[PDB]
Amino acid sequence: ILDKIFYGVLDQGNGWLYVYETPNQDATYDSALELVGQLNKVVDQLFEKASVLY
Amino acid sequence: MSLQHEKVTIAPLVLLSALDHYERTQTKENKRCVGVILGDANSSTIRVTNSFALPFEEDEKNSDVWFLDHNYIENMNEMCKKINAKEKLIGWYHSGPKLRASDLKINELFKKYTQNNPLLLIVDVKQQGVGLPTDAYVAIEQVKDDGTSTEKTFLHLPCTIEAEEAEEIGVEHLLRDVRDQAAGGLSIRLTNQLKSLKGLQSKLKDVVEYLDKVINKELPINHTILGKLQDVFNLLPNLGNNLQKALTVKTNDELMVIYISNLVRSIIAFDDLIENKIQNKKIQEQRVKDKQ
Amino acid sequence: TLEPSTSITLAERQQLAYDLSISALLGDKIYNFGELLHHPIMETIVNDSNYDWLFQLLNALTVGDFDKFDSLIKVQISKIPILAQHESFLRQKICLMTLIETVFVKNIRMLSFEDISKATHLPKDNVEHLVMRAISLGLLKGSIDQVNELVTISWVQPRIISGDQITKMKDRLVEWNDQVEKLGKKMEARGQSIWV
Amino acid sequence: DAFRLIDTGALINNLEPRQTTSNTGLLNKANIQALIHGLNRHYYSLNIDYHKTAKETKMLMNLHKEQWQSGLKMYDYEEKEESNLAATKSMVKIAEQYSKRIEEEKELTEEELKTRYVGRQDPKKHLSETADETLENNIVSVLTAGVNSVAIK
Amino acid sequence: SLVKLFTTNELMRWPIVQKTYEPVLNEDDLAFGGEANKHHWEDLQKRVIEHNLRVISEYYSRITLLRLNELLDLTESQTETYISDLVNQGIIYAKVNRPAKIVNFEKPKNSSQLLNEWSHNVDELLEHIETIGHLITKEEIMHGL
């Protein structure tokens, strides 16, 4: 379980071994977060380009 | 027998020839106008491409007094074959406004000239309609909806007006005063959405009116129509619970994507503003140091 | 497809209607006798008393009567051995009639084992096989649940619609159309700046 | 463009049949290659004026009228997520290319930028196009979903 | 009749088959035709149990273990073994709940399936309303005459 081979959860109730389906971790949010980081860097570079204007 | 009645495609030339025919023979009210619908067939999508006038005559009397010339069909056939052998007779059209009594009867006259089942094309030549003024009606034999003898009657088919390269050029040139060539994408899609909603409302009102008629017994009881209506009600989803949660989660994800895209658009506008300010400053400096 | 040129012998057509009723009662993929009852073919024995017993039995089948069905089937089981052979099939037909009519009357997309047992006279242990037959034959498209007896029902076999049902459907249509019109009015009013 | 032959020996008078009593005929300009075959030498050109009718122009509009039962039709709700994910990944890559573009633009002279993005993907118009296209598709999807969820019920 | 038995979506009793069609099957060669054909009867039992499960999973959703053993007629543990094997091969979606003695034959539906089904229902509704609209005019012409 610690090595994430099957995504069940062991319990100490009376010896039960609840088994749960693999989580989803949708790729859309990871892609959005990398996009947000890249756009942050783009903002800093663009403002640096604006130094000549100032 | 060919089952080719799934889809119908009409080039604008057939329809405009219909309008020209109606305005030419000076047809007054109650006088229907009929011609032939030369095209290509034997495929699933029946396609109408060219038409011509017919000397159809009928007195507003007993439905069997209809008259139509037999030699004219073959005489037009020979000349049109000489002009183009790829256009074959695939039925007939009448100048609307709606189905009449003799439509089933006269259709059998075109059975021999046609190769497949003859095609009926209703043309709202005087333009009372709001949607497409064309609809197809293939005469087929099916059991009566009242549990009586099987009847050979017409079946509506989904007709879409579509043009080829030759006729699209002319259509685009002719109405090159009213079509909004700028329009915009999202705006035109939203306008299509609203038009579809209004069409749904109109069809709903028509169905309500027909039911109001049937409860007063001005029309008989058709169990097929009532069964289809009950099926429509059964298919109506209940939203206002698991489906509700799924729709909500999808809408939230979709709005997050919209947020990301708007952020990207704003940063693009930022770069555009920065570059434009830079160029304006350079232009100001140019004019200042070249004047002096 | 019968023609009005000749209707052959009235007695022979009466026997044909008798055979049609027998086959409908003893036919598998038939679970609504309304078509036969309100057809002109039944006018041949709409008055005769020799075959009135099967007309009463068909009426009980459509309504769903149990004790009257039991008495009639006991009396007429000896009329023909053909019906006596398939008595169990007729009882299963009674059970399916009761299930379908109870689903269509009580409505509710869910059900319970006890309700079906009371409305079909079968024990609470044979309801499962009853719904097995019902789903297999195409009457319903539901799904069973035995740990908690909560039989789930989906689209049901359609029935001929009477005059009263038209008013309710018409009112529901009116409400739906009014909702659609209100939504369209709001949509048009809100975005009139871009509807071009 | 219609044509009609010159008369004959009116070239002796040199008055090919053309009395410019109006400017409506002189506005049109003769084609270049048409004069090579001879335009004002054998067949004086004419004017062409397509005249329409209200009935015809009203209803040729039907060529671009969609079927009524297609506006409320949402498409399968799996492609509308794969497309969003692909658009987001493309946006990430294009933003990275935009960063390297801004980095490289610091040390380039105008005589190159006037021709720099001729042969390679300008990673700015791609970003704007992707943003606008995905936003339009997304707005249409949201409106269709909400409209059907409210009205259809 | 044997083909009818293995084509209808209806559970069958194993002893009923093993005592009804057994004589006709036994008086044969090649298959079910002697001591060397004892290899076939076990296969027939396995096939009928597999058909029973394929029907129950298509109908049931929360079958309890005791009734599942009653229907399949497997003793107590052969049932769980069979369920395990058929799900491991990948024919049926099943999940046991031994402490609760429940079987969840239903497959949980992802949001994509739910919205696709809703969209298909709305499309069918629109098509049906179009057909109703186009039949109303036809019948009005038929009986307005």
- Report the 10 Å Cβ neighbour count for B207: 22
Amino acid at D49: D
- Dist. CA C52–CA C50, nearest whole Å: 6
3 state DSSP class of E30: coil
Residue with tokens 């960063």: D99
- State which residue of chain C sits closest to D146, comparing Cα positions: C183
Residue listed under structure tokens 């034999």:
B141
Q: Which residues of chain D lie closer than 8 angstroms to B127, CB-CB?
A: 55, 58-59
Q: What is the DSSP string of chain B?
A: -----SEEEE-HHHHHHHHHHHHHTT--TT---EEE--EE-SSSEEEE---EE---B--SSSGGG-B--SHHHHHHHHHHHHH-TT-B--EEEE--SS--STHHHHHGGGGTT-SSS-EEEEE-TT---SS-SEEEEEEEEE--TTSSS-EEEEEEE-EEE---HHHHHHHHHHTTTTS-SS--HHHHHHHHHHHHHHHHHHHHHHHHHHHHHHHTTSS---HHHHHHHHHHHHH------HHHHHHHHHHHHHHHHHHHHHHHHHHHHHHHHHHHHHHHHHHHHHHHHHH-
Q: How close B274 comes to chain A (CA, Å)?
A: 6
Quick one: DSSP state of residue D18?
-
Amino acid identity, residue B161?
Answer: I
Cβ pair E125:D148 closer than 8 A:
no
Calpha distance C184→D150 (Å, rounded): 11
Residue A22 half-sphere exposure toward CB, CA atoms < 13 A: 6
Count CB-CB contacts under 10 A for residue D102: 19
Strands (E), chain C: none
The pairing of beta strand B119-123 with beta strand B91-94: parallel
**Chain C neighbors of E122, CB-CB under 8 A:** none
CA distance E40 to B146: 55
* B161 phi, psi to nearest 5 deg: -80, 120
Q: Which residues contact A51 (CB under 8 A, 6 or more apart)?
A: none
Instruction: For B152, list phi and psi in degrees, rounded to 5.
Output: -95, 100
- Under 8 Å between Cβ of B117 and B89: no
**CA B102 remoteness from chain centre:** 24
Is there a contact between B234 and C155 (Cβ–Cβ < 8 Å)? yes
Length of chain B (residues) = 292
Q: Are the C-beta atoms of C103 and C140 separated by less than 8 Å?
A: yes
Find out whether C132 and C149 touch, Cβ atoms under 8 Å: no
Neighbours of D105 (CB within 10 A): 13
Kindly tell me the number of DSSP H helices and DSSP E strands found in chain C. Answer: 9, 0
Per the CB < 8 A criterion, the answer to whether B206 and C180 are in contact is no
D84 in A contact zone (CB under 8 Å): yes
With beta carbons under 8 A apart, name residues in chain A contacting D85: 27-28, 31
Torsion of CA E30, E32, E34, E35, to 10 degrees: 110
Residue whose token pair is 């990398």: A34
Q: Is D77 in Cβ contact with E119 (below 8 Å)?
A: yes
Token readout for D21 is 């009593």
Closest by Cα among B36, B28, B29 to B119: B36
| Among B170, B178, B136, residue whose Cα is nearest residue B155 | B136
Other CB atoms within 10 A of residue C185 CB: 11
| CA end-to-end span of chain D | 58
Q: For residue D124, give the nearest of D151, D104, D97, D87 by alpha carbon.
A: D97
Q: Is residue B264 within 8 Å of residue D90, measured between CB atoms?
A: no
Closest by Cβ to E62, choosing from C132, C135, C146: C146
Cβ-contact C176, C183 below 8 angstroms: no
The gap from C-alpha B194 to its chain's centroid, in whole angstroms, comes to 17
Out of E9, E64, E106, the one facing C147 most closely (by C-beta) is E64
Chain C residues touching residue B150 (CB < 8 angstroms): 1
How far is CA C175 from its chain centroid?
29
How many other CB atoms are there within 10 angstroms of residue C191's CB atom?
14
Q: Which two tokens stand for residue D88?
A: 């987001």
The Cα B259–Cα B265 span in angstroms is 10
Q: Measure CA of the first residue to CA of the last residue in chain A; give whole Å.
A: 58
Q: Are the C-beta atoms of B120 and B139 separated by less than 8 Å?
A: yes
Question: Comparing C-alpha atoms, which of E83, E128, E121, E119 is closest to residue E101?
Answer: E83
- Dihedral sign, CA of B181, B184, B187, B193? positive
| In contact, B90 and B118? CB cutoff 8 Å | yes
Q: What are phi and psi of B120, to 5 degrees?
A: -95, 135
Q: CB within 8 A of B17, min separation 6: which ones?
A: B35, B50, B51, B52, B53
- Measured distance CA(B32)–CA(E63) in Å, rounded: 67
Enumerate the β-bridge partners of residue B36.
B52, B92
Domain extent for D128: 76-153
- Which SS3 state, helix, strand or coil, does residue C110 take? strand
Phi and psi at residue C151, to the nearest 5°: -45, 125
Q: Hey, which residues does C143 pair with through a beta bridge?
A: C152
A4: left (phi over 0), alpha (psi -120 to 50) or beta: left
Which of the residues A39, A44, A48, A51 would you substitute to probe the B interface, choosing the one with the greatest number of B C-beta atoms within 10 Å? A39
Q: How far apart are CA C146 and CA C157, in angstroms?
A: 24
Nearest to B51 by CA among B7, B104, B92, B103: B92
Closest residue by Cα to residue E134 from B90, B96, B228, C162: B228
- Which chain E residues are Cβ-neighbours of C152 within 8 angstroms? 61
Q: Residue B92 belongs to a domain with what CATH number? A: 3.40.140.10
Do D and C make contact via 3 or more CB pairs under 8 A? The reply is: yes
The secondary structure element, H or E, covering residue D4 is strand D3-5
Q: What is the DSSP letter of C144?
A: B
Strands of B45-48's sheet, edge to edge? Answer: B39-40, B45-48, B7-10, B159-161
Task: Check: CB of residue D85 under 8 Å from CB of residue A28.
Answer: yes
Two tokens, residue B74: 């073959």
B91-94/B34-36 β-pairing: antiparallel
CA dist., res. C146 & res. B239, Å (int): 27
Q: What is the DSSP letter of E9?
A: S
Q: Which of C155, C180, C195 sits opposite B234 (nearest CB)?
A: C155
Residues facing residue B124 across a β-bridge: none
CA B124 to CA B95: how far, in whole Å?
A: 6
Closest by alpha carbon to C165, among A53, D70, B98, B230? B230
Q: Is B231 on the interface with E (CB under 8 A)?
A: yes
Q: Are E125 and B235 in contact (CB under 8 A)?
A: yes
Breaks following residues of chain B (C-to-N distance > 2.5 Å): 240
Q: Are B174 and D62 in contact (CB under 8 A)?
A: no
Which candidate, B254, B262, B274, A38, places its Cα nearest to that of D130?
Answer: B262
Assign 3-class secondary structure to C46-60: CCCCCCHHHHHHHHH
Query: Taking CB atoms and an 8 Å limit, are E119 and D76 in contact across chains?
Result: yes
Strand order in the sheet with B119-123: B52-53, B34-36, B91-94, B119-123, B134-142, B151-157
Bridge partner list, B156: B137
Q: What residues of chain B lie within 8 A of the CB of C168, using their CB?
A: none
- Give the strand pairing for B7-10 and B159-161: parallel
**E81 CB burial (10 A radius; 0-12, 13-18, 19+):** exposed
A33 touches chain B (CB under 8 A): no
Partners of residue E96 on adjacent β-strands: E103
Collect all residues of chain A within an 8 Å Cβ-Cβ radius of residue B271. Answer: 46
- Residue C21 is classified by DSSP as H
CB contact under 8 A, B256 and A32: yes
Judge contact between B117 and B1, C-beta under 8 A: yes
Distance CA C54, CA E86 (A): 49
Q: Which chains touch A (3 or more CB pairs under 8 A)?
A: B, D
C44 sits in which H/E element: none
The number of helix segments (H) and strand segments (E) in chain E equals: 7, 0
Terminal-residue alpha carbon distance, chain B: 90
Nearest to B154 by CA among B137, B132, B174, B131: B137
Interface contact C160-B223, CB threshold 8 A: yes
Cα dist from C80 to C44, C49, C72, C83, whole Å:
20, 17, 13, 6
Instruction: Give the chain D residue whose CA is nearest to the CA of C172.
Output: D153
- Are E63 and C133 an interchain contact pair (Cβ–Cβ within 8 Å)? no
Q: How was this entry determined? A: cryo-EM
Torsion angle, alpha carbons of E76, E79, E82, E86, to 10: -160
- Resolution number, Å: 3.6
Q: How far apart are CA E136 and CA B225, in angstroms?
A: 8
Candidates E55, E62, E69, E129: best to mutate against C (most CBs of C within 10 A) is E62
Q: Is D112 exposed, middle or buried (0-12, 13-18, 19+ CB in 10 A)?
A: exposed
Maximum Cα–Cα distance across chain B: 101
Q: How far apart are CA B157 and CA B160, in angstroms?
A: 10
The three-point CA angle B105-B108-B111 to 5° equals 165
Do residues D60 and B175 make contact, with C-beta atoms less than 8 angstroms apart?
A: yes
Is D55 in contact with B23 (Cβ distance < 8 A)?
Answer: yes
Half-sphere exposure (Cβ direction) of E131: Cα atoms closer than 13 Å: 15
Q: What span, in angstroms and rounded, lies between the C-alpha atoms of B101 and B136?
A: 16
Three-class DSSP category at D67: coil
CA dihedral C34, C36, C42, C47 (to 10 degrees): -40
Q: Is C67 on the interface with B (CB under 8 A)?
A: no
Query: Best residue in B251, B271, B277 to probe A by mutation, most A CBs within 10 Å?
Result: B271
Residue C187 neighbours by CB under 8 Å, 6+ apart: B194, B197, D147
- Are chains C and A touching, using the cut-off of 8 Å on CB pairs and a minimum of 3 such pairs? no
Q: Give C154's strand partners.
A: none
| Length of chain C, in residues | 196
Six-digit token string for B275 = 């570059």
Cα(C56)–Cα(C45) distance, integer angstroms: 11
Asked if D84 contacts A28 with a C-beta cutoff of 8 angstroms, the reply is yes
Task: Report yes or no: D16 and D10 within 8 Å, Cβ to Cβ.
Answer: yes
State how far the Cα of B50 lies from the Cα of B40, in Å rounded to an integer.
Answer: 10
**Nearest Cα to Cα of residue E12 among E62, E58, E48:** E48
Chain-chain contact of B178 with D77 (C-beta, under 8 angstroms) = no
CA angle B1, B7, B8 (to 5 degrees): 100
Distance CA B112, CA B114 (A): 5
Q: Is the Cβ–Cβ distance between C24 and C30 less than 8 Å?
A: yes
Shortest Cα–Cα distance, B132 to chain D (Å): 6
Residue with tokens 């004086």: D44
Amino acid identity, position D74: M
Q: Are A35 and D91 in contact (CB under 8 A)?
A: yes
Contact list, D147 vs chain C (CB under 8 Å)? 183, 187
Smallest Cβ–Cβ distance between B203 and the set E124, E133, E140 belongs to E133
Handedness of CA C6, C8, C14, C15 (dihedral sign): negative
Helix axes C87-106, C127-136, angle to 10 degrees: 90
Name residue B56's amino acid: F
H or E element at residue C100: helix C87-106
Strand partners, B138: B119, B155
Task: Name the minimum distance, in Å, from the CA of A43 to any CA of chain D.
Answer: 9
How many residues does this entry show for chain D? 153
Q: Where are the alpha helices (DSSP H) in C4-51?
A: 10-25, 34-37
Domain region containing B126: 3-177
Assign 3-class secondary structure to B53-64: ECCCECCCCCHH
Helix (H, G, I), strand (E, B) or coil at E64: strand
> Tokens 């024990």 — which residue?
C123
d(CA C108, CA B282): 76
Residue position matching structure tokens 């256009």: B87
> Could you give the CA distance from residue E84 to residue E90 in angstroms, rounded to a whole number?
10
Burial class (CB in 10 A: 0-12, 13-18, 19+), C148: exposed
**Chain A environment of D89 (Cβ under 8 Å):** 31
What does the alpha-carbon distance between residue E118 and residue D72 come to, in Å, rounded to a whole number?
13
- At B268, the amino acid letter reads I
